[PDB]
Amino acid sequence: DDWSKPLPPSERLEQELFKYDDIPVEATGNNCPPHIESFSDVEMGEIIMGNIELTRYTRPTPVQKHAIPIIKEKRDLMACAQTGSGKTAAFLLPILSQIYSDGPGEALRAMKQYPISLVLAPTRELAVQIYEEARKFSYRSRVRPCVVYGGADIGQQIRDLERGCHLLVATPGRLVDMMERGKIGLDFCKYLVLDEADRMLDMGFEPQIRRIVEQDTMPPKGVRHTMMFSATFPKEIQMLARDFLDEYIFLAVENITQKVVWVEESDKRSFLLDLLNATGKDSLTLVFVETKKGADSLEDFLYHEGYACTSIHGDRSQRDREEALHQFRSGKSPILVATAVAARSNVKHVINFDLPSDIEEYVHRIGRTGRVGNLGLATSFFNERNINITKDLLDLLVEAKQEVPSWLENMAYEHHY
Amino acid sequence: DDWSKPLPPSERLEQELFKYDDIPVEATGNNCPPHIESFSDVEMGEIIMGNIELTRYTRPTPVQKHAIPIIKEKRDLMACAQTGSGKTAAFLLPILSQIYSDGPGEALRAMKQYPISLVLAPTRELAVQIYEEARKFSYRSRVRPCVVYGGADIGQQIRDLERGCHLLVATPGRLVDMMERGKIGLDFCKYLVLDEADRMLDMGFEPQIRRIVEQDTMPPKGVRHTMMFSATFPKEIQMLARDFLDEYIFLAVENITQKVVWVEESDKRSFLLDLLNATGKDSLTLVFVETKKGADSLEDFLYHEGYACTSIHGDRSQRDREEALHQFRSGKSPILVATAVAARSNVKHVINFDLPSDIEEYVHRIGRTGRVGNLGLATSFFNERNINITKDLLDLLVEAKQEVPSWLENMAYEHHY
RNA sequence: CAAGGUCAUUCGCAAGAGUGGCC
RNA sequence: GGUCAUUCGCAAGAGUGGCCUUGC
Ligand SMILES: [Cl-]
Ligand SMILES: [Cl-]
Ligand SMILES: [Cl-]
Ligand SMILES: [Cl-]
Ligand SMILES: [Cl-]
Ligand SMILES: [Cl-]
Ligand SMILES: [Cl-]
Numbered sequence: 073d074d075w076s077k078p079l080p081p082s083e084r085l086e087q088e089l090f091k092y093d094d095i096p097v098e099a100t101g102n103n104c105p106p107h108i109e110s111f112s113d114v115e116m117g118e119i120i121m122g123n124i125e126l127t128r129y130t131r132p133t134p135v136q137k138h139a140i141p142i143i144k145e146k147r148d149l150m151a152c153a154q155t156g157s158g159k160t161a162a163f164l165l166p167i168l169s170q171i172y173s174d175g176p177g178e179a180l181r182a183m184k185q186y187p188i189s190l191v192l193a194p195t196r197e198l199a200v201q202i203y204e205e206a207r208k209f210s211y212r213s214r215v216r217p218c219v220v221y222g223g224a225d226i227g228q229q230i231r232d233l234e235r236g237c238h239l240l241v242a243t244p245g246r247l248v249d250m251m252e253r254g255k256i257g258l259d260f261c262k263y264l265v266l267d268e269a270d271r272m273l274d275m276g277f278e279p280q281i282r283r284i285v286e287q288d289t290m291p292p293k294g295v296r297h298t299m300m301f302s303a304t305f306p307k308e309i310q311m312l313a314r315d316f317l318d319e320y321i322f323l324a325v326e327n328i329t330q331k332v333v334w335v336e337e338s339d340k341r342s343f344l345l346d347l348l349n350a351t352g353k354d355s356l357t358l359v360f361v362e363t364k365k366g367a368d369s370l371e372d373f374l375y376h377e378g379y380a381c382t383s384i385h386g387d388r389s390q391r392d393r394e395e396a397l398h399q400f401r402s403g404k405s406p407i408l409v410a411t412a413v414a415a416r417s418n419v420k421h422v423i424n425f426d427l428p429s430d431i432e433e434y435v436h437r438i439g440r441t442g443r444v445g446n447l448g449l450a451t452s453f454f455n456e457r458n459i460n461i462t463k464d465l466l467d468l469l470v471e472a473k474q475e476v477p478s479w480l481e482n483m484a485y486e487h488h489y
Numbered sequence: 490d491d492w493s494k495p496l497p498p499s500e501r502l503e504q505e506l507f508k509y510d511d512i513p514v515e516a517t518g519n520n521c522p523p524h525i526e527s528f529s530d531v532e533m534g535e536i537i538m539g540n541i542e543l544t545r546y547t548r549p550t551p552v553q554k555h556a557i558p559i560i561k562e563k564r565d566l567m568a569c570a571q572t573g574s575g576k577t578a579a580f581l582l583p584i585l586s587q588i589y590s591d592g593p594g595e596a597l598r599a600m601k602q603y604p605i606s607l608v609l610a611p612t613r614e615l616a617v618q619i620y621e622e623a624r625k626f627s628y629r630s631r632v633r634p635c636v637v638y639g640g641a642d643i644g645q646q647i648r649d650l651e652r653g654c655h656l657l658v659a660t661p662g663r664l665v666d667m668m669e670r671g672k673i674g675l676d677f678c679k680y681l682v683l684d685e686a687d688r689m690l691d692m693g694f695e696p697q698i699r700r701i702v703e704q705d706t707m708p709p710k711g712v713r714h715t716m717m718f719s720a721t722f723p724k725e726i727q728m729l730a731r732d733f734l735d736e737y738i739f740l741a742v743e744n745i746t747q748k749v750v751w752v753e754e755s756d757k758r759s760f761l762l763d764l765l766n767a768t769g770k771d772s773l774t775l776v777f778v779e780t781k782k783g784a785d786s787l788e789d790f791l792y793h794e795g796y797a798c799t800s801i802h803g804d805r806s807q808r809d810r811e812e813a814l815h816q817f818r819s820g821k822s823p824i825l826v827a828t829a830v831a832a833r834s835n836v837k838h839v840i841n842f843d844l845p846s847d848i849e850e851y852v853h854r855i856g857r858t859g860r861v862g863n864l865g866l867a868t869s870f871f872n873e874r875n876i877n878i879t880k881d882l883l884d885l886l887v888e889a890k891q892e893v894p895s896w897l898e899n900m901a902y903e904h905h906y
Numbered sequence: 907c908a909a910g911g912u913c914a915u916u917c918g919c920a921a922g923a924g925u926g927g928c929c
Numbered sequence: 930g931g932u933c934a935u936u937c938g939c940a941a942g943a944g945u946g947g948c949c950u951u952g953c
Contacts, residue, residue: 076493077590078532109910110942115495118535128920130941173494363949386951412911412950429912429949460912463940488939489922526934529918545944547917780925803927829926829935846925846936877936880916905915906946 075175078119078212089208090126092468094157094325095435096416097134101321105145107138114144116169123209124165133158138323139299140166148298148320150313152305157325159267159301160205163191167263167297168209171238177260184255185233187218187240189263190290192281194272196221196243202267203241215239222246230255244272244280251288258290262297266316269302270309278312285316293318328442328450330474332465335453340425341373347423347451348379348407355420356400359409360437362426367409370425374407381407384414417443424452431464454480463488492592495536495629506625507543509885511574511742512551512849513856518738522562524555531561533586540626541582550575555740556716557583565737566716567730572615574742576684576718577622580608584680584714585626588655594677601672602650604635604657606680607707609698611688613638613660619684620658632656639663647672661689661697668705675707680714683733687719687726695729702733710735745859745867747891749882752870757842758790764840764868765796765824772837773817776826777854779843784826787842791824798824801831834860841869848881871897880905 099107108114111124111132132140135153139162142149153159167189180186191206193199203219210217218237220229222245229246233255240247240256250256264285266272272281290296298317302309305324313320335343344359351357361367364385371383382396382405393413399405408414412428415436422441428434434452442448452465462484469476516524525531528541528549549557552570556579559566570576584606597603608623610616620636627634635654637646639662646663650672657664657673667673681702683689689698707713715734719726722741730737752760761776768774778784781802788800799813799822810830816822825831829845832853839858845851851869859865869882879901886893 074491074493076491076535112942115535118532118538121535122532125919128941130920415951430910433911433950527918542943545917547944833927847934850926850935 073175073181073214075172075214076117076119078122079214081212085211086126089211090128091156091471092431092435094153095134095432096439097138097323097325099138099142099321099323101147102319104321105141105147108132108141109137111140111165114140114166114169116144116165117172119172119211119213120165120169120209123211126211127208129161133162135159135323135325136162139163142321142323143167143297143299144169146170146297148293148317149323150300150305150310150317150320151323151325152303153301153323153325154303155268160202161209163265163299163301164202164206164209167265168206168213168215168239171215171263172213176238179260184257185218185237185240186257186260187237188260189239189265190247190258190261190284191239191241191265191267192247192272192284193221193241193243193267194275194277195268196223198267199241199243206239206241210239217241220246220250222249244277244284248280248283251284258284258288261290262295263299264290264296264316265299265301267301269300269312270304270306271302273308273312281312326442326472326474327445328438328448328472330438330450330452330469330472332452332454332469332477332480334455334477334479336455337457340453341370343453344374344423344425345377347421348374351406351421354403354406356403356418357407357421357423358414358419358437358440359407359423359425360415360428361409361411362428364411366426367411371409374409379407380405381409383409385411386413388413414440418446419443420446420448422448422450424450427452427454427458427461427465429460431461431468434461434465434468459483459487490592490598492589492631493534493536495539496631498629502628503543506628507545508573508888509848509852511570512852514551514555514740514742516555516559516738516740518564519736521738522558522564525549525558526554528557528582531558531583533561533582534589536589536630537582537586537626540628543628544625546578550579552576552740552742553579556580559738559740560584560714560716561586563587563714565710565714565734566740567734567737568716568718568740568742569720569722570718570740570742571720572685577619578626580682580716580718581619581623581626584682585623585630585632585656588632588680589630593655596677601674602635602654602657603674603677604654605677606656606682607664607675607678607701608656608658608682608684609664609689609701610638610658610660610684611692611694613640615684616658616660623656623658627656634658637663637667639666661694661701665697665700668701675701675705678707678713680716681707681733682716682718684718685720686717686729687721687723690725690729698729743889743891744863745855745865745889747855747867747869747886747889749869749871749886749894749897751872751894751896753872754874757870758787760870761791761840761842762794764838765791768823768838771820772823773820773835774824774838774840775831775836775854775857776824776840776842777832777845778826778828779845781828783843784828788826791826796824797822798826800826802828803830805830832857835863836860836865837863838866838868841867844869844871844875844878844882846877848878848885851878851882852885876900876904 135157143166199219199221206217215238216236217239218233220242222243300313367383367385371381374381382399384393384396400408419441422438438450466484552574560583616636616638623634632655633653634656635650637659639660717730784800784802788798791798799816801810801813817825836858839855855867883901
């Protein structure tokens with residue numbers, strides 16, 4: 073009855089089983105656990121780490137970087153995250169990891185089915201999707217996932233439950249039916265997550281959810297560990313979160329024309345001058361560069377060429393920074409040269425004089441333009457010093473439905489394949 | 490009382506804690522388990538895999554690649570391996586891995602000290618060395634190693650034991666002393682390894698070893714798991730192995746002048762012709778090349794230049810191979826051109842026309858010369874295509890006390906550092 | 907003094923390419 | 930055909946190193 077010990081392998085089973093808008097992400101709450109950079113930063117045990125290998129799962133998605141460490145400290149979570157941010161692994165990994173570590177508990181040890189974990193989904197296509205990922209992370213484990221949803225044969229689902237159910241995925245209406253039929257009890261449900269809670273509300277599932285969570289045998293908030301996921305955060309969702317969550321963490325996650333052009337290092341100042349000379353009366357331009365001395369040298373160059381500009385970087389005093397922000401937003405010096413210091417308001421044009429080394433700085437940078445309904449332009453200079461970001465920038469431009477330079481996908485092929 | 494679960498970390502403790510002759514290696518026995526290429530191919534659990542990370546052990550030494558899989562399948566082992574082959578990790582990792590997996594057993598649960606594992610060493614230099622390696626692999630575990638040796642204060646060792654001892658490292662004379670004093674009992678010793686058994690015999694420790702292993706409470710062979718390590722294998726060691734081991738696996742692991750020279754690809758045939766033209770009357774030369782058609786094209790070249798040579802590679806029939814070995818061994822065609830097919834007798838000169846991609850194939854190749862008391866010569870041609878083996882070949886030449894080309898250690902610096 | 911990113915190398919993992927060897 | 934091993938490109942993890950960027 074050790075649940076941290078992996079079962080004997082099975083290769084037949086093995087082969088059967090085996091976006092960018094969400095990168096500005098902030099979690100706020102009491103003693104919020106800091107976000108991780110890799111699945112290695114949390115110790116989720118042999119089975120979980122094993123099955124992570126088998127999925128070929130590489131790095132944690134932005135939501136996974138913040139959700140996973142929150143879940144592992146058994147803190148409730150209200151997460152506003154969209155379809156495609158890696159929500160499923162974000163809660164399935166730490167929950168199962170804890171289930172392996174603790175085992176089934178003396179109630180189910182000295183023993184209808186009692187799932188230790190209940191995942192509620194609005195639709196059949198998402199319930200099955202969550203279920204399929206649960207089997208991949210429960211492979212070679214004694215934890216058996218099940219899935220239960222309306223619109224299909226209830227007789228076959230009943231037959232699957234009786235083969236054992238410790239993690240249950242379900243749609244609200246079909247789960248209510250299984251408890252009236254006395255096939256499921258929630259008396260030992262220590263983990264409850266609600267996926268796409270907004271859609272679950274939109275589809276009219278609140279009475280079933282309140283019946284599942286409040287009018288029956290499920291342990292209350294503070295005892296059970298609760299997670300809510302929803303793409304939008306209207307007040308209806310906030311009131312359900314205050315009803316269902318306890319001392320929780322709030323986690324929150326392209327009207328911009330993006331142009332990438334090839335510019336050799338010795339041509340960058342000339343290319344910049346041409347972009348500035350085509351800039352309107354009082355449009356503000358944000359010029360991002362790599363190094364503090366780069367920002368210093370470039371502001372002097374622009375001054376000697378007759379452009380009213382200013383500068384800001386990490387070694388600037390808070391006073392020097394305020395002076396630059398004054399001249400910039402008064403329009404007197406409408407060009408601001410900055411390092412990463414100014415990646416994290418109403419800027420019309422962001423120029424990546426130097427592209428950054430990682431795709432996340434690129435997101436933060438272009439996020440200073442094209443704000444709240446305005447039109448924004450982001451122009452980036454690219455050469456051989458930037459192949460380290462070829463593949464991630466190409467993937468981003470494709471997702472953003474931006475024009476992709478034909479030579480850029482050619483260099484992604486030639487370097488990565 | 491779960492021993493697979495890691496303890497809370499400890500920062501202070503962490504930084505407190507954190508050859509090439511041995512690579513022709515063969516294990517023979519009944520259903521001998523196959524050798525591994527990485528520590529990952531055997532599942533030694535969270536704690537072990539953890540602490541391997543923390544020591545930064547990257548790959549298994551040749552002895553480890555064969556010993557570890559043998560130990561994990563609970564097979565006795567007689568290993569002829571020298572100090573410096575990674576013996577300690579070879580038995581410490583799988584033994585501790587199993588102890589974590591099984592725990593202490595229901596005997597020690599309901600409870601002088603009873604070590605589950607006893608390591609016997611000839612000297613305190615090796616006892617302390619093994620003990621320090623055991624602490625690195627038992628960090629954050631509930632398994633406590635101890636070390637006990639003559640020549641030091643027995644009073645301090647006694648008080649270390651009663652803080653708990655599950656893995657005991659000891660010298661024979663000081664151990665028997667502890668069991669006469671009733672401080673150590675062997676009634677639960679399921680793992681026994683004897684390190685440098687030859688030296689232990691040389692130093693006169695057989696009566697103590699026979700008293701420890703045969704005349705007291707240690708479980709007999711076939712019940713306990715026994716491993717013997719010794720640098721030499723005289724018949725005295727073999728008789729001790731037949732008394733102490735049960736259905737065991739036998740594991741067995743610089744009179745060659747080695748020259749490395751820079752040869753561009755278009756110059757190799759010219760360089761080879763000069764080596765052949767300086768070859769004695771009835772000396773046999775082995776010329777190793779990379780590809781089968783490389784071997785074909787080179788035997789044709791040597792033929793059209795008037796050299797009696799022959800060839801062998803993987804796509805040659807057993808008949809074609811015997812014909813080539815006939816002309817080679819008779820002296821009629823004293824040059825044999827071969828791929829790796831002939832790396833694994835009385836060869837005077839081995840020429841690595843093409844250096845191999847891995848350092849293991851290199852030694853197997855040079856092992857065909859300088860055998861049975863004969864000064865052998867090994868000539869290797871090197872260029873840009875062989876930088877992948879720069880550091881392994883440089884390290885090997887240094888250990889072999891061979892002359893190192895000054896340009897070779899310079900290219901190791903510029904590529905790896 | 908803390909964080910993070912990139913680059914070199916070492917190392918385990920997958921996909922891919924090339925080559926070698928075994929039946 | 931089927932198995933195995935090595936190397937190289939890339940993806941991702943850990944350490945060393947170098948470089949750079951931030952916070953105080
Ligand atoms: Cl439903
Ligand atoms: Cl339950
Ligand atoms: Cl200031
Ligand atoms: Cl050793
Ligand atoms: Cl002694
Ligand atoms: Cl014992
Ligand atoms: Cl034949």
